[PDB]
């Protein structure tokens, strides 16, 4: 909805790091749903065919993930699960551009970036913005942000949480315990013939 009028002109960048991130991308998800009783395959044909033609494989280059979402009873919802899995793993530009200023700029805003040494001349969505005093840097992440080890850890963490919370009755009778906290200080003063102690415990 928002555009930042003060773009990153060729004179206004001073560092960049712009990849295409395709490390984690796959082309087939099979989702088991109902009580593990029915299944759906989400099928990226393009990526499978491209890997075949590229590598010279005898058959389409399947790379697969298996998920079980056993509370899902709707097939079209199970499709969405798998689609979402593919979409969030896809190859994307996810570059850093380093500039100055742009205090008004937020994630979700659009900005024009021109970097002639890189052949960039585009309007991009800001995924993240970082401000550094001292070095006086504004660091724009454009298009998308991906994690590193934290992406692996969060994907595992969510999976563990999902499996842990299976079989929990969510309409179960609630109970409550209140954590409360109070303290008394005992001060000690010791006096011997009008002389105070130097330390007391």
């Amino acid at each position: 909805t928002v555009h930042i009028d003060r773009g990153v002109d060729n004179t206004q960048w001073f560092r960049y790091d712009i990849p295409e991130l395709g490390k984690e991308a796959i082309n087939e998800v099979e989702v088991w749903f109902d009580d593990g009783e029915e299944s759906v395959i989400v099928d990226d044909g393009t990526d499978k065919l491209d890997l075949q033609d590229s590598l010279g494989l005898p058959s389409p280059g399947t790379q697969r993930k298996e998920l079980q979402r056993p509370l899902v009873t709707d097939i079209s919802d199970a499709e969405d699960i798998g689609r979402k899995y593919l979409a969030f793993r896809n190859s994307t530009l996810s570059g850093t551009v380093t500039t100055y200023g742009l205090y008004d700029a937020e994630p979700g805003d659009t900005i024009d970036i021109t970097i002639d040494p890189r052949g960039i001349d585009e309007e991009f969505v800001i995924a993240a913005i970082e401000y550094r005093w001292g070095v006086d840097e504004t660091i724009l992440t454009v298009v998308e942000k991906r994690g590193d080890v934290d992406d692996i850890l969060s994907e595992l963490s969510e999976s563990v949480q999902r499996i842990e919370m299976q079989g929990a009755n969510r309409d179960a009778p609630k109970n409550r315990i209140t954590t409360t906290n109070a303290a008394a200080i005992v001060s000690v003063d010791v006096d011997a013939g009008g002389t105070s102690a130097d330390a007391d415990r």
């Binding site: 994690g147 080890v149 934290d150 850890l153 969060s154 963490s157």
Partner: peptide, 25 residues
């Protein structure tokens, strides 16, 4: 210069765990 691998890994652990702590666990 010789750099102690234990010291780099011990010193930076603080910062390696922060991205994940920002995201919950």
């Amino acid at each position: 210069a010789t750099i102690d691998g234990r010291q780099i890994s011990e010193s930076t652990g603080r910062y390696r765990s922060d991205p994940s702590r920002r995201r919950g666990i």
